[PDB]
Design a protein around this ligand. Structure first.
Ligand SMILES: *[C@@H]1O[C@H](CO)[C@@H](O[C@@H]2O[C@H](CO)[C@@H](O[C@@H]3O[C@H](CO[C@H]4O[C@H](CO[C@H]5O[C@H](CO)[C@@H](O)[C@H](O)[C@@H]5O)[C@@H](O)[C@H](O[C@H]5O[C@H](CO)[C@@H](O)[C@H](O)[C@@H]5O)[C@@H]4O)[C@@H](O)[C@H](O[C@H]4O[C@H](CO)[C@@H](O)[C@H](O)[C@@H]4O[C@H]4O[C@H](CO)[C@@H](O)[C@H](O)[C@@H]4O[C@H]4O[C@H](CO)[C@@H](O)[C@H](O)[C@@H]4O)[C@@H]3O)[C@H](O)[C@H]2NC(C)=O)[C@H](O)[C@H]1NC(C)=O
Ligand SMILES: *[C@@H]1O[C@H](CO)[C@@H](O[C@@H]2O[C@H](CO)[C@@H](O[C@@H]3O[C@H](CO)[C@@H](O)[C@H](O[C@H]4O[C@H](CO)[C@@H](O)[C@H](O)[C@@H]4O[C@H]4O[C@H](CO)[C@@H](O)[C@H](O)[C@@H]4O)[C@@H]3O)[C@H](O)[C@H]2NC(C)=O)[C@H](O)[C@H]1NC(C)=O
Ligand SMILES: C[C@H]1O[C@H](O[C@H]2[C@H](O)[C@@H](O)[C@@H](O[C@H]3[C@H](O)[C@@H](O)[C@@H](O)O[C@@H]3CO)O[C@@H]2CO)[C@H](O)[C@@H](O)[C@@H]1N[C@H]1C=C(CO)[C@@H](O)[C@H](O)[C@H]1O
Ligand SMILES: *[C@H]1O[C@H](CO)[C@@H](O)[C@H](O)[C@@H]1O
Ligand SMILES: *[C@H]1O[C@H](CO)[C@@H](O)[C@H](O)[C@@H]1O
Ligand SMILES: *[C@H]1O[C@H](CO)[C@@H](O)[C@H](O)[C@@H]1O
Ligand SMILES: *[C@H]1O[C@H](CO)[C@@H](O)[C@H](O)[C@@H]1O
Ligand SMILES: *[C@H]1O[C@H](CO)[C@@H](O)[C@H](O)[C@@H]1O
Ligand SMILES: *[C@H]1O[C@H](CO)[C@@H](O)[C@H](O)[C@@H]1O
Ligand SMILES: *[C@H]1O[C@H](CO)[C@@H](O)[C@H](O)[C@@H]1O
Ligand SMILES: *[C@H]1O[C@H](CO)[C@@H](O)[C@H](O)[C@@H]1O
Ligand SMILES: *[C@H]1O[C@H](CO)[C@@H](O)[C@H](O)[C@@H]1O
Ligand SMILES: *[C@H]1O[C@H](CO)[C@@H](O)[C@H](O)[C@@H]1O
Length: 471
């Protein structure tokens, strides 16, 4: 269709735009140091000309997956990023120093100096996301015989971030949207993931991560509290409803292609994640004029949370794409398992798309399976069409699009918007990320304990990168 062709061309635009936003050769961000991912080239109204640990980590993880799939030209970009982080980790900032909380700092100036003004800090999801991005490259390094780079450069940087996660996971902080000071689903979910793959990586380089091991099961134990019985609570200590795309992001970014539809880890096809998906998406159906007239079986423009007032509260490209990505992941999981199950928890999600839905197990060769996956694929593609409809003619994706007229607003050419497009497109094409070991990390302890474990901190100096040839 035109969606297919638009996506193929947009994926090329997205890759280029991301590179334009990374220093020190990025065309849109002169001033940014080497390997510094800038959130947006917008220097004013709003000023997003800074580097966020979260956006950077999410973007780099996307680039690492493309690289491992054959986009070898991204190698230098990844190396520069890792080199820049060795410096950033040691930058004394309002959150602290390397070993005293500095790693939880949300953003920095593009020249690698600390941002000293007031900001919602700390944001504990950053160290987890940065660790996950680096671990993926470290795995490639190990697999391709560059053991030294993995052991001496990557591992020590990762060890710092994992120590921060294990030490402070059970403390409040700001959510990914930088507004709620409390405890957040997305954050807890990505932290659990980071400790699990961090322990596997530590073992691989001949070291260990005892703190990853003791804390991961406890974080997972706590993660269960976010399920309300009908949807996933985005944050504790909040007065909002709790329906928030924060939860869809938590699911797609902790998706493991080897995982079943596990409720404990909220995988994309888990009854809990599907039930949550309908609750979150439905919360935007009546608040945006842009959604007027659409029925419940049709995709709609999705924002962050229904109570949002940032720029008056509008749909976001990355949030609308996350709604589609969770479904592409679920389709992949159902296909790989050879069946789909409908339970009392997920019945409403399915019934909205296929009125004949009934609880039961449906094999991939059954008529019901076929009807359901077709309906789900159409629904998912629907979200992507809404994005296509509001992107600029040359493919530019801003942070938000107007709730009434769909015009682009807020930060222009948002790097995260482009990475979200690349991942949704990949999943749509059944291109999945490497597994993180969910299959041996979904067991919940019988009793949850408020605890922590302190790891270790040590400053890393990147003397030089070996002549790595990636073919
Ligand atoms: C698809 O096509 C689109 C359209 O062409 C492409 O998007 C355009 O991309 C160009 C860059 O190639 C952008 O140029 C920059 O513009 C800003 C000013 O932007 C504001 O004003 C624009 C003009 O407004 C007026 O005209 C329009 C009609 O043309 C009219 O409608 C409007 O009412 C008004 O009359 C606006 O268009 C623009 O809006 C956009 O952004 C909004 C905010 O994000 C968003 O909400 C909107 O929806 C819209 O998207 C906005 O209001 C210039 O400031 C900027 O100049 C800097 O960069 C150039 C080099 O790139 C440099 O020569 C300048 O000296 C200056 O450099 C500073 O900033 C750089 C980073 O931006 C930095 O690297 C430099 O070192 C330097 O930084 C230092 O100083 C700053 C001072 O603030 C400081 O903060 C730093 O710390 C540091 O010390 C560019 O000229 C267009 O804005 C943009 N247009 C649109 C509509 O988006 C798109 O890229 C294409 N996509 C693809 C994939 O190809
Ligand atoms: C550190 O780790 C410990 C151990 O894991 C954490 O302790 C657990 O904390 C959770 C969350 O407080 C707690 O769960 C609550 O149990 C209560 C009953 O014992 C419930 O009343 C409470 O209900 C809320 O959550 C439900 C979903 O589970 C919602 O359906 C319900 O509407 C409630 O949500 C509203 O109210 C809360 C106030 O609790 C508010 O913050 C929300 O925004 C929302 O408005 C929870 O189920 C566990 O019992 C605790 N476990 C133990 C063993 O003590 C601790 O929270 C961690 N601390 C940090 C900072 O990480
Ligand atoms: C970029 C960021 O901007 C906004 O956040 C800041 C607010 O503008 C400030 O007002 C202040 O928010 C405080 C509230 O006013 C207060 O009522 C209470 O909620 O505490 C808040 C924190 O102290 O500071 C905010 C920064 O912490 C906007 O609300 C926020 O959502 C924006 N974040 C986006 C930007 C990027 C960069 O691409 C992403 O990393 C985030 O995920 C986006 O959500
Ligand atoms: C998640 O992982 C646990 C082990 O930690 C399994 O028991 C479960 O079946 C799933 O694979
Ligand atoms: C599954 O595994 C976890 C540890 O990962 C245990 O805590 C749980 O009791 C179950 O054996
Ligand atoms: C948190 O609590 C656990 C036990 O509940 C300890 O093992 C840990 O050292 C920390 O005190
Ligand atoms: C994390 O916090 C626990 C308390 O829950 C401490 O015992 C531990 O030393 C670390 O500081
Ligand atoms: C956590 O606590 C341990 C023991 O005090 C330290 O070694 C570590 O640096 C972190 O502060
Ligand atoms: C924690 O442990 C690391 C790795 O063993 C040390 O290098 C560091 O100094 C701290 O003692
Ligand atoms: C802690 O560990 C780092 C990474 O190996 C070293 O650079 C530092 O000198 C200290 O041994
Ligand atoms: C590790 O941390 C030190 C400061 O404690 C820095 O000088 C070094 O560049 C690295 O970031
Ligand atoms: C890397 O190593 C250098 C010394 O070669 C230190 O100055 C830096 O703090 C980091 O440990
Ligand atoms: C690169 O190698 C130098 C050799 O002196 C170290 O000092 C530095 O810590 C980095 O590992």
């Amino acid at each position: 269709a035109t969606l297919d062709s638009w996506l193929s061309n947009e994926a090329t635009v997205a890759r280029t735009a991301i590179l334009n936003n990374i220093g020190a050769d990025g065309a849109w961000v002169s001033g940014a140091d080497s390997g510094i991912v800038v959130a947006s080239p917008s220097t004013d109204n709003p000023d997003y000309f800074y580097t966020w640990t979260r956006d950077s980590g999410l973007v780099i993880k996307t680039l690492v997956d493309l690289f491992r799939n054959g986009d070898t030209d991204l190698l230098s970009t990844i190396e520069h990023y890792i080199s820049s982080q060795a410096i950033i980790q040691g930058v004394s900032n309002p959150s602290g120093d390397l070993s005293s909380g500095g790693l939880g700092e949300p953003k920095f100036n593009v020249d690698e100096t600390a941002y000293t003004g007031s900001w919602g800090r700390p944001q504990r999801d950053g160290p987890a996301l940065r660790a996950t991005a680096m671990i993926g490259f470290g795995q490639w390094l190990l697999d391709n015989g560059y053991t030294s780079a993995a052991t001496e450069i990557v591992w020590p940087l990762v060890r710092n971030d994992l120590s921060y996660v294990a030490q402070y996971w059970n403390q409040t902080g700001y959510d990914l949207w930088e507004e709620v000071n409390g405890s957040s689903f997305f954050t807890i979910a990505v932290q659990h993931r980071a400790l699990v793959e961090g322990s596997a990586f530590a073992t691989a380089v001949g070291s260990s991560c005892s703190w990853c091991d003791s804390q991961a099961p406890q974080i997972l134990c706590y993660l269960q509290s976010f399920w309300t019985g009908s949807y996933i609570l985005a944050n504790f200590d909040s007065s909002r409803s709790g329906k928030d795309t924060n939860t869809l992001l938590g699911s797609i970014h902790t998706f493991d292609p080897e995982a079943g539809c596990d409720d404990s880890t909220f995988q994309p096809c888990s009854p809990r994640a599907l039930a949550n998906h309908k609750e979150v998406v439905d919360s935007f159906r009546s608040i945006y004029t842009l959604n007027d007239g659409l029925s419940d079986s049709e995709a709609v423009a999705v924002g962050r949370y229904p109570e949002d007032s940032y720029y008056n509260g509008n749909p976001w490209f990355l949030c609308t794409l996350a709604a589609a990505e969770q479904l592409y992941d679920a389709l992949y999981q159902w296909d790989k398992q050879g069946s789909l199950e409908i339970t009392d928890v997920s019945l409403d999600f399915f019934k909205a798309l296929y009125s004949g839905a009934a609880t039961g197990t449906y094999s991939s060769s059954s008529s019901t399976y076929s009807s359901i996956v077709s309906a789900v694929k159409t629904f998912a593609d629907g979200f992507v069409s809404i994005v296509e409809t509001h992107a600029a003619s040359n493919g530019s994706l801003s942070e938000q699009f107007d709730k009434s007229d769909g015009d682009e607003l807020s930060a222009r050419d948002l790097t995260w918007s482009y990475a979200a497009l690349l991942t949704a497109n990949n999943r749509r094409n059944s291109v999945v990320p490497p597994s993180w070991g969910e299959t041996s990390a979904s067991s919940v302890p019988g009793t949850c304990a408020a605890t922590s474990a302190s790891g270790t901190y040590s400053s890393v100096t990147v003397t030089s990168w070996p002549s790595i040839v990636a073919t």
